[PDB]
Design a binder for these strands. Structure first.
Ligand SMILES: Nc1nc2c(ncn2[C@H]2C[C@H](O)[C@@H](COP(=O)(O)OP(=O)(O)OP(=O)(O)O)O2)c(=O)[nH]1
Ligand SMILES: [Ca+2]
Ligand SMILES: [Ca+2]
Ligand SMILES: [Ca+2]
Length: 341
DNA sequence: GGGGGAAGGATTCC
DNA sequence: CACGGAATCCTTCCCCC
């Protein structure tokens, strides 16, 4: 089995660049302005010119300007990036039917029944990078190996604008020398939990007693890490289907006042319903980011679809249920619709 | 003992 | 200061064969 993984470079910023080539070369930071104050917000992402100086995704815009006061700060435009992604995903289908669209900017292609080895795969990769650059003008990174996880790491290592082949031999080197925290799915919190067990490489998970591992990071993670370490991990390329759609917005100021929170919640419901596109959800969740940046939610599943009118009415009750069970002030509020009909 | 679902929380960035 | 979207997993609670 041969898996090919494509991941677009600094995608959002790169898109802003394609839509305005004069940006090429300058540091570009795509931002999400909350509207709390002049420059309040966070960095969506930034091109490498800016990333080399510490401006990455997540930090406050304000902190970005303290580092690169003269970089180009553009507001984030999801819709556009969304349509640019789609177009690219379509070129990929022109290489395989078995394709899993993992996110807005990466996909796994099953090319096992279309190539005979890795040198011929390395070739199909260069082919794809070129077809994407020529058509949409976007540079991507390609990762190639036996399963999805290893293909992603290959990419992770070749970024940016690269292509790497992690073959069966190297898979052996990696399971030994690979830093466990560099494995897709191991975040800082799962990364630290594994330290307390003295696990620094995939191989270490083999020598610890399952029930202990299983009781430190949960059954799923554990079996996942083990199969990888044992070289017997091999999940298939699945055609993913959206199971959720929603929107969360930030308010001008924290509050626990129902009437001054509703407007944000209703707008979230409107943009939400517009994106459903013919789809009818049976479950709705009201999500709230409290003041100490802690997330809370309250949902309801219906035996039928939810009309926009029932959405408005029901979300208000769930918000009320939130302000009643939680004493904290609310910073961000939104809605999420699921269990589509 | 345990299927199956729903709900609220936790974690990754896949 | 610290935005935003969505998948997957964990745990407790329920209902009940
Ligand atoms: N709003 C927001 N968007 C994010 C965040 N992180 C990632 N994104 C979006 C914008 C990125 O362009 C897009 C693709 O994410 P990637 O992890 O692949 O990062 P990117 O492609 O930007 O750089 P990369 O070449 O992969 O190192 O995901 C975030 O924290 N907030
Ligand atoms: Ca990317
Ligand atoms: Ca990506
Ligand atoms: Ca990591």
């Amino acid at each position: 089995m041969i898996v090919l993984f494509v991941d677009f470079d600094y995608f959002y910023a790169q898109v802003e660049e394609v839509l305005n080539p004069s940006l090429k070369g300058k540091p570009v930071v795509v931002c999400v302005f909350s509207g709390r104050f002049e420059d309040s917000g966070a960095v969506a992402t930034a091109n490498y010119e800016a990333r080399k100086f510490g401006v990455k995704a997540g930090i406050p815009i304000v902190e970005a300007k303290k580092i690169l006061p003269n970089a180009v700060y553009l507001p984030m435009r999801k819709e556009v990036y969304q349509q640019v992604s789609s177009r690219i995903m379509n070129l990929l289908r022109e290489y395989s039917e078995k394709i899993e669209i993992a996110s807005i900017d990466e996909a796994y292609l099953d090319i096992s029944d279309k190539v005979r080895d890795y040198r011929e795969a390395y070739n199909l990769g260069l082919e794809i990078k070129n077809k994407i650059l020529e058509k949409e003008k976007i540079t991507v990174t390609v990762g190639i190996s036996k399963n999805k996880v290893f293909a992603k790491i290959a990419a992770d290592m070749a970024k940016p604008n690269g292509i790497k082949v992690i073959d069966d031999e190297e898979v052996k080197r990696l399971i030994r020398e690979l830093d466990i925290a560099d494995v897709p799915g191991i975040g800082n919190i799962t990364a630290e939990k594994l330290k307390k067990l003295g696990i620094n490489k995939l191989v270490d998970t083999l020598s610890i007693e399952f029930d202990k591992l299983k009781g430190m990071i949960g059954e799923a993670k554990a079996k996942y890490l083990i199969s990888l370490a044992r070289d017997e991990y091999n999940e298939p390329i699945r055609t993913r289907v959206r199971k959720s759609i929603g929107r969360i917005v930030t308010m001008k100021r924290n509050s626990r006042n129902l009437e001054e929170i509703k407007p944000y919640l209703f707008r979230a419901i409107e943009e939400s319903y517009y994106k459903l596109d013919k789809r009818i959800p049976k479950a709705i969740h009201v999500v709230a980011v409290t003041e100490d940046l802690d997330i809370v939610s309250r949902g309801r599943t219906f035996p039928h679809g939810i009309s926009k009118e029932t959405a408005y009415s029901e979300s208000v009750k769930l918000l009320q249920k939130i302000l009643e069970e939680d004493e904290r002030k609310i910073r961000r509020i939104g809605v999420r619709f699921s269990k589509f009909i």
